Amino acid sequence: ALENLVVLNAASVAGAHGILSFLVFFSAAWYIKGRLAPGAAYAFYGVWPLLLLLLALPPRAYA
Numbered sequence: 810a811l812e813n814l815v816v817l818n819a820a821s822v823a824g825a826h827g828i829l830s831f832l833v834f835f836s837a838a839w840y841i842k843g844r845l846a847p848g849a850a851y852a853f854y855g856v857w858p859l860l861l862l863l864l865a866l867p868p869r870a871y872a
Contacts, residue, residue: 816867829864832857 820826839845866872 811867811869813865820864826864829860832860832864
């Protein structure tokens, strides 16, 4: 029944779940350099964005 804005607030306080949510903000942070050493960080995109719907909500989610 809990949504994102629910675990997001607690996630930040918790710590781990906090830096994990930044995954979206990190993607841009890395772009700062503009060299994202292609190869690994590139292929990761294969299932890296998937964590979006995974972390977004907590386990207690029917999602």
